Protein backbone atom coordinates (compact mmCIF):
# COMPACT_ATOMS: atom_id res chain seq x y z
CA UNK A 1 0.00 0.00 0.00
CA UNK A 2 1.43 3.34 -1.22
CA UNK A 3 1.06 6.28 1.23
CA UNK A 4 2.32 9.89 1.64
CA UNK A 5 4.71 11.13 4.38
CA UNK A 6 3.68 14.46 5.90
CA UNK A 7 3.42 16.77 8.87
CA UNK A 8 0.13 18.43 9.91
CA UNK A 9 -0.33 21.94 11.32
CA UNK A 10 -3.68 23.20 12.69
CA UNK A 11 -5.40 26.45 11.45
CA UNK A 12 -3.58 28.44 14.23
CA UNK A 13 -0.18 27.20 12.78
CA UNK A 14 0.45 24.96 15.82
CA UNK A 15 2.68 21.95 15.06
CA UNK A 16 2.04 18.39 16.31
CA UNK A 17 4.62 16.55 18.50
CA UNK A 18 4.78 13.33 20.59
CA UNK A 19 4.46 13.94 24.38
CA UNK A 20 4.24 10.33 25.53
CA UNK A 21 4.26 6.70 24.38
CA UNK A 22 0.69 7.15 22.83
CA UNK A 23 0.13 10.88 22.92
CA UNK A 24 0.42 13.96 20.64
CA UNK A 25 0.27 17.64 21.69
CA UNK A 26 -0.13 20.80 19.61
CA UNK A 27 2.07 23.81 20.19
CA UNK A 28 3.73 26.64 18.33
CA UNK A 29 7.34 25.79 17.51
CA UNK A 30 10.16 28.23 16.55
CA UNK A 31 11.37 27.84 12.94
CA UNK A 32 14.62 26.14 14.05
CA UNK A 33 12.53 23.47 15.92
CA UNK A 34 10.38 22.56 12.83
CA UNK A 35 12.21 19.12 12.66
CA UNK A 36 10.37 18.11 15.93
CA UNK A 37 7.03 17.78 14.06
CA UNK A 38 5.62 14.21 14.22
CA UNK A 39 5.79 12.48 10.78
CA UNK A 40 2.50 10.95 9.57
CA UNK A 41 2.10 8.21 6.92
CA UNK A 42 -1.26 8.99 5.29
CA UNK A 43 -2.56 5.97 3.28
CA UNK A 44 -5.61 5.84 1.03
CA UNK A 45 -8.06 3.15 2.12
CA UNK A 46 -10.77 1.25 0.16
CA UNK A 47 -14.02 3.07 0.92
CA UNK A 48 -16.78 5.71 0.66
CA UNK A 49 -15.81 8.28 -2.03
CA UNK A 50 -18.60 10.83 -1.32
CA UNK A 51 -18.27 14.32 -2.94
CA UNK A 52 -15.48 16.18 -0.96
CA UNK A 53 -14.59 13.13 1.31
CA UNK A 54 -11.67 10.63 0.86
CA UNK A 55 -11.09 7.62 3.27
CA UNK A 56 -7.56 7.71 4.82
CA UNK A 57 -5.55 6.07 7.60
CA UNK A 58 -3.02 8.06 9.67
CA UNK A 59 0.01 6.10 10.84
CA UNK A 60 3.06 7.55 12.61
CA UNK A 61 5.85 6.84 10.13
CA UNK A 62 8.54 6.53 12.86
CA UNK A 63 6.52 4.44 15.41
CA UNK A 64 4.48 1.20 15.26
CA UNK A 65 1.35 3.34 15.79
CA UNK A 66 -1.89 4.34 14.05
CA UNK A 67 -4.52 6.85 15.09
CA UNK A 68 -7.81 5.10 15.87
CA UNK A 69 -11.23 6.04 17.25
CA UNK A 70 -13.04 4.03 19.89
CA UNK A 71 -15.64 4.67 22.60
CA UNK A 72 -14.65 5.19 26.31
CA UNK A 73 -17.62 5.69 28.75
CA UNK A 74 -20.05 6.41 25.77
CA UNK A 75 -17.54 8.95 24.42
CA UNK A 76 -15.80 8.87 20.98
CA UNK A 77 -12.06 9.01 21.75
CA UNK A 78 -8.88 9.38 19.73
CA UNK A 79 -6.00 7.05 20.53
CA UNK A 80 -2.64 5.99 19.18
CA UNK A 81 -2.73 2.18 18.81
CA UNK A 82 0.25 -0.17 18.61
CA UNK A 83 0.31 -2.37 15.42
CA UNK A 84 2.86 -4.78 13.86
CA UNK A 85 4.53 -2.50 11.20
CA UNK A 86 4.95 -5.40 8.73
CA UNK A 87 1.16 -5.80 8.19
CA UNK A 88 0.57 -2.10 7.51
CA UNK A 89 -0.65 -0.12 5.57
CA UNK A 90 -3.57 -2.41 4.47
CA UNK A 91 -5.82 -1.58 1.47
CA UNK A 92 -8.71 -3.00 3.57
CA UNK A 93 -7.79 -1.02 6.74
CA UNK A 94 -9.83 -1.82 9.92
CA UNK A 95 -12.83 0.57 10.44
CA UNK A 96 -11.45 2.07 13.69
CA UNK A 97 -8.40 3.54 11.83
CA UNK A 98 -10.46 5.08 8.99
CA UNK A 99 -10.72 8.86 8.72
CA UNK A 100 -12.71 10.80 6.12
CA UNK A 101 -10.24 13.38 4.73
CA UNK A 102 -12.39 16.44 3.84
CA UNK A 103 -11.03 19.23 1.58
CA UNK A 104 -12.90 22.53 2.36
CA UNK A 105 -11.84 26.22 2.37
CA UNK A 106 -8.38 24.99 1.06
CA UNK A 107 -7.98 23.04 4.39
CA UNK A 108 -8.03 19.48 5.74
CA UNK A 109 -10.53 17.97 8.16
CA UNK A 110 -10.25 14.40 9.49
CA UNK A 111 -13.60 12.99 10.52
CA UNK A 112 -13.75 9.57 12.17
CA UNK A 113 -15.52 7.18 9.74
CA UNK A 114 -16.63 5.33 12.99
CA UNK A 115 -18.10 8.51 14.62
CA UNK A 116 -19.79 10.95 12.18
CA UNK A 117 -19.31 14.67 13.13
CA UNK A 118 -16.25 13.80 15.31
CA UNK A 119 -12.96 15.23 14.13
CA UNK A 120 -9.21 15.25 14.90
CA UNK A 121 -9.02 18.41 17.04
CA UNK A 122 -6.65 20.71 18.96
CA UNK A 123 -7.45 23.26 21.61
CA UNK A 124 -6.80 27.05 21.27
CA UNK A 125 -4.48 26.75 24.31
CA UNK A 126 -0.80 25.84 23.89
CA UNK A 127 0.57 22.35 24.46
CA UNK A 128 -2.62 20.44 24.98
CA UNK A 129 -3.17 16.89 23.58
CA UNK A 130 -4.58 16.19 20.12
CA UNK A 131 -8.10 14.67 20.58
CA UNK A 132 -11.42 13.74 18.96
CA UNK A 133 -13.87 16.67 19.13
CA UNK A 134 -15.70 19.07 16.77
CA UNK A 135 -21.22 25.41 19.04
CA UNK A 136 -17.62 24.69 20.09
CA UNK A 137 -14.00 26.02 20.38
CA UNK A 138 -12.07 23.02 19.01
CA UNK A 139 -9.75 23.53 16.01
CA UNK A 140 -10.58 20.96 13.28
CA UNK A 141 -8.70 22.43 10.26
CA UNK A 142 -5.19 21.43 9.24
CA UNK A 143 -2.54 22.10 6.55
CA UNK A 144 -0.35 19.25 5.26
CA UNK A 145 3.37 19.85 4.45
CA UNK A 146 5.47 17.24 2.70
CA UNK A 147 8.50 15.64 4.33
CA UNK A 148 11.77 16.44 2.61
CA UNK A 149 14.39 17.25 5.35
Amino acid at each position, epitope marked *: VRSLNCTLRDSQQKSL*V*M*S*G*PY*EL*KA*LH*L*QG*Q*DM*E*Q*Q*V*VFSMSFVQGEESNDKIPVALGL*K*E*K*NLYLSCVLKDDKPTLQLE*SV*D*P*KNYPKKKMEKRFVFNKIEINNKLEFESAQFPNWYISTSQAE*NMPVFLGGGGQDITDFTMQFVS*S
Partner: antibody
Amino acid sequence: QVQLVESGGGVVQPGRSLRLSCAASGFTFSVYGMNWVRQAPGKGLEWVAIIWYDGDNQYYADSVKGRFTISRDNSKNTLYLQMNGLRAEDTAVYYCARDLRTGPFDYWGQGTLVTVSS
Amino acid sequence: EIVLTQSPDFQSVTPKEKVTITCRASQSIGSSLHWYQQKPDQSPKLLIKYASQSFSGVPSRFSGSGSGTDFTLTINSLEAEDAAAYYCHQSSSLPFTFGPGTKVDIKR
Protein backbone atom coordinates in the same frame (compact mmCIF):
# COMPACT_ATOMS: atom_id res chain seq x y z
CA GLN B 1 26.34 24.83 19.33
CA VAL B 2 24.47 22.00 21.11
CA GLN B 3 26.19 21.33 24.48
CA LEU B 4 25.32 18.71 27.12
CA VAL B 5 27.39 18.63 30.39
CA GLU B 6 26.83 15.87 33.04
CA SER B 7 27.95 16.25 36.68
CA GLY B 8 27.44 14.25 39.87
CA GLY B 9 29.26 10.97 39.33
CA GLY B 10 31.41 9.49 42.08
CA VAL B 11 31.86 6.64 44.56
CA VAL B 12 28.64 5.59 46.36
CA GLN B 13 27.89 2.76 48.87
CA PRO B 14 25.36 0.05 47.73
CA GLY B 15 21.80 0.72 48.89
CA ARG B 16 22.44 4.51 49.05
CA SER B 17 21.38 7.29 46.60
CA LEU B 18 22.96 9.73 44.08
CA ARG B 19 21.70 12.64 41.89
CA LEU B 20 23.09 13.20 38.37
CA SER B 21 22.70 16.48 36.50
CA CYS B 22 22.98 17.40 32.81
CA ALA B 23 23.05 21.09 31.78
CA ALA B 24 22.06 21.95 28.19
CA SER B 25 22.77 24.99 25.94
CA GLY B 26 22.59 25.97 22.25
CA PHE B 27 19.05 24.72 21.50
CA THR B 28 15.41 25.16 22.67
CA PHE B 29 15.68 22.67 25.63
CA SER B 30 11.94 22.91 26.44
CA VAL B 31 10.86 21.27 23.12
CA TYR B 32 13.27 18.23 23.02
CA GLY B 33 13.07 14.88 24.76
CA MET B 34 16.04 13.97 26.97
CA ASN B 35 17.51 10.58 27.90
CA TRP B 36 20.02 8.80 30.12
CA VAL B 37 22.10 5.97 28.58
CA ARG B 38 24.70 4.03 30.61
CA GLN B 39 27.73 1.87 29.90
CA ALA B 40 29.27 -0.54 32.42
CA PRO B 41 33.09 -1.05 32.05
CA GLY B 42 33.82 -3.08 28.89
CA LYS B 43 30.12 -3.51 28.05
CA GLY B 44 27.49 -2.35 25.52
CA LEU B 45 25.31 0.81 25.68
CA GLU B 46 22.13 0.42 27.78
CA TRP B 47 19.16 2.83 27.51
CA VAL B 48 18.06 3.94 31.00
CA ALA B 49 15.19 6.45 30.67
CA ILE B 50 13.36 9.10 28.62
CA ILE B 51 11.57 12.28 29.66
CA TRP B 52 9.39 13.99 27.05
CA TYR B 53 9.95 17.74 26.29
CA ASP B 54 7.39 19.16 28.81
CA GLY B 55 8.25 16.63 31.55
CA ASP B 56 4.61 15.41 31.89
CA ASN B 57 5.75 11.90 30.99
CA GLN B 58 8.69 9.58 31.24
CA TYR B 59 9.67 5.94 30.58
CA TYR B 60 12.29 3.57 32.12
CA ALA B 61 14.09 0.40 31.12
CA ASP B 62 13.04 -2.64 33.32
CA SER B 63 16.58 -2.74 34.84
CA VAL B 64 16.03 0.70 36.56
CA LYS B 65 12.18 0.76 36.70
CA GLY B 66 11.22 1.76 40.27
CA ARG B 67 14.78 2.32 41.52
CA PHE B 68 15.50 5.36 39.29
CA THR B 69 13.70 8.71 38.74
CA ILE B 70 14.19 10.89 35.60
CA SER B 71 13.17 14.58 35.85
CA ARG B 72 13.89 17.98 34.28
CA ASP B 73 13.72 21.75 34.93
CA ASN B 74 13.06 23.64 31.63
CA SER B 75 13.71 27.05 33.31
CA LYS B 76 17.29 25.95 34.18
CA ASN B 77 17.80 23.85 30.99
CA THR B 78 18.69 20.90 33.28
CA LEU B 79 18.04 17.16 33.13
CA TYR B 80 18.11 15.02 36.30
CA LEU B 81 18.54 11.38 37.32
CA GLN B 82 17.87 10.29 40.89
CA MET B 83 19.33 6.85 41.59
CA ASN B 84 18.19 4.78 44.62
CA GLY B 85 19.01 1.23 45.72
CA LEU B 86 22.32 1.44 43.80
CA ARG B 87 24.12 -1.91 43.44
CA ALA B 88 27.52 -3.10 41.99
CA GLU B 89 25.82 -3.68 38.52
CA ASP B 90 24.94 0.06 38.44
CA THR B 91 28.67 0.98 38.12
CA ALA B 92 28.75 2.70 34.69
CA VAL B 93 29.47 5.89 32.80
CA TYR B 94 26.12 7.72 32.59
CA TYR B 95 25.51 9.81 29.47
CA CYS B 96 22.70 12.29 28.96
CA ALA B 97 21.43 12.49 25.32
CA ARG B 98 18.88 14.57 23.44
CA ASP B 99 16.54 12.73 21.10
CA LEU B 100 15.18 13.96 17.78
CA ARG B 101 11.33 13.32 17.50
CA THR B 102 11.69 10.51 20.23
CA GLY B 103 13.93 8.82 17.65
CA PRO B 104 17.72 8.92 17.45
CA PHE B 105 19.95 10.27 20.27
CA ASP B 106 21.41 13.12 18.19
CA TYR B 107 23.60 14.87 20.87
CA TRP B 108 25.43 13.28 23.77
CA GLY B 109 27.10 14.62 26.89
CA GLN B 110 30.68 13.65 27.92
CA GLY B 111 29.43 11.12 30.55
CA THR B 112 29.79 10.87 34.34
CA LEU B 113 31.26 7.80 36.12
CA VAL B 114 29.20 6.30 38.92
CA THR B 115 31.12 3.81 41.09
CA VAL B 116 28.97 1.57 43.32
CA SER B 117 31.10 -0.20 45.97
CA SER B 118 31.59 -0.92 49.71
CA GLU C 1 10.54 -5.77 24.29
CA ILE C 2 12.26 -5.49 20.87
CA VAL C 3 15.70 -7.16 20.94
CA LEU C 4 18.45 -6.18 18.50
CA THR C 5 21.35 -8.39 17.50
CA GLN C 6 24.51 -7.37 15.73
CA SER C 7 26.75 -9.38 13.40
CA PRO C 8 29.68 -9.87 13.61
CA ASP C 9 30.88 -9.33 17.17
CA PHE C 10 34.31 -8.22 15.77
CA GLN C 11 35.36 -7.12 12.28
CA SER C 12 38.91 -6.69 10.94
CA VAL C 13 39.15 -4.21 8.08
CA THR C 14 42.02 -3.08 5.89
CA PRO C 15 41.95 0.77 5.37
CA LYS C 16 40.17 1.63 2.00
CA GLU C 17 37.95 -1.47 2.25
CA LYS C 18 34.19 -1.25 1.76
CA VAL C 19 32.81 -2.85 4.95
CA THR C 20 29.22 -3.88 5.87
CA ILE C 21 27.92 -4.77 9.40
CA THR C 22 24.38 -5.87 10.25
CA CYS C 23 21.72 -5.26 12.91
CA ARG C 24 18.61 -7.52 13.22
CA ALA C 25 15.38 -6.68 15.11
CA SER C 26 13.24 -9.39 16.88
CA GLN C 27 10.12 -7.62 15.49
CA SER C 28 9.43 -5.34 12.49
CA ILE C 29 10.54 -1.75 13.33
CA GLY C 30 9.85 0.02 10.00
CA SER C 31 12.84 2.27 9.45
CA SER C 32 13.20 3.34 13.12
CA LEU C 33 16.77 2.05 13.49
CA HIS C 34 19.74 4.33 14.32
CA TRP C 35 23.53 3.84 14.13
CA TYR C 36 26.13 5.20 16.52
CA GLN C 37 29.91 5.21 16.68
CA GLN C 38 31.81 4.87 19.97
CA LYS C 39 35.58 5.05 20.44
CA PRO C 40 36.98 3.69 23.80
CA ASP C 41 36.57 6.12 26.76
CA GLN C 42 34.74 8.52 24.37
CA SER C 43 31.15 9.61 24.13
CA PRO C 44 29.05 7.82 21.33
CA LYS C 45 28.05 9.84 18.31
CA LEU C 46 25.08 9.50 15.92
CA LEU C 47 25.99 8.27 12.44
CA ILE C 48 22.73 7.38 10.64
CA LYS C 49 19.14 8.12 11.61
CA TYR C 50 16.02 6.18 10.44
CA ALA C 51 17.99 3.41 8.76
CA SER C 52 19.35 5.37 5.79
CA GLN C 53 19.19 9.15 6.48
CA SER C 54 22.35 11.19 6.87
CA PHE C 55 23.15 13.22 9.99
CA SER C 56 24.92 16.64 9.73
CA GLY C 57 28.70 16.54 9.98
CA VAL C 58 29.00 12.76 9.55
CA PRO C 59 31.56 11.79 6.81
CA SER C 60 29.90 10.61 3.58
CA ARG C 61 31.63 7.14 3.90
CA PHE C 62 29.01 6.07 6.45
CA SER C 63 25.83 4.76 4.85
CA GLY C 64 22.85 2.87 6.22
CA SER C 65 20.15 0.79 4.51
CA GLY C 66 17.34 -1.64 5.40
CA SER C 67 13.70 -1.74 6.64
CA GLY C 68 11.47 -4.07 8.71
CA THR C 69 13.88 -6.34 10.67
CA ASP C 70 17.18 -6.32 8.67
CA PHE C 71 19.55 -3.36 8.74
CA THR C 72 23.07 -2.63 7.49
CA LEU C 73 25.75 0.00 8.11
CA THR C 74 28.28 0.46 5.32
CA ILE C 75 31.71 2.12 5.65
CA ASN C 76 32.61 3.07 2.06
CA SER C 77 36.47 3.06 2.28
CA LEU C 78 37.46 2.59 5.94
CA GLU C 79 39.92 5.10 7.43
CA ALA C 80 42.28 4.35 10.38
CA GLU C 81 40.11 6.57 12.69
CA ASP C 82 37.07 4.29 11.99
CA ALA C 83 38.25 1.49 14.47
CA ALA C 84 35.50 1.77 17.06
CA ALA C 85 32.39 0.11 18.44
CA TYR C 86 29.27 0.44 16.24
CA TYR C 87 25.86 0.31 17.84
CA CYS C 88 22.34 0.14 16.41
CA HIS C 89 19.31 1.41 18.47
CA GLN C 90 15.57 1.13 17.82
CA SER C 91 12.93 3.81 18.55
CA SER C 92 9.86 2.07 17.02
CA SER C 93 8.48 1.20 20.52
CA LEU C 94 9.18 1.45 24.21
CA PRO C 95 11.30 0.41 26.01
CA PHE C 96 14.06 1.68 23.68
CA THR C 97 16.88 -0.83 23.05
CA PHE C 98 20.46 -0.94 21.70
CA GLY C 99 22.08 -3.88 19.87
CA PRO C 100 25.21 -5.39 21.54
CA GLY C 101 27.58 -3.64 19.13
CA THR C 102 30.21 -4.51 16.52
CA LYS C 103 33.86 -3.78 17.27
CA VAL C 104 35.72 -2.85 14.11
CA ASP C 105 39.53 -2.94 14.13
CA ILE C 106 42.43 -2.46 11.65
CA LYS C 107 43.56 -5.55 9.78
CA ARG C 108 47.31 -6.09 9.40
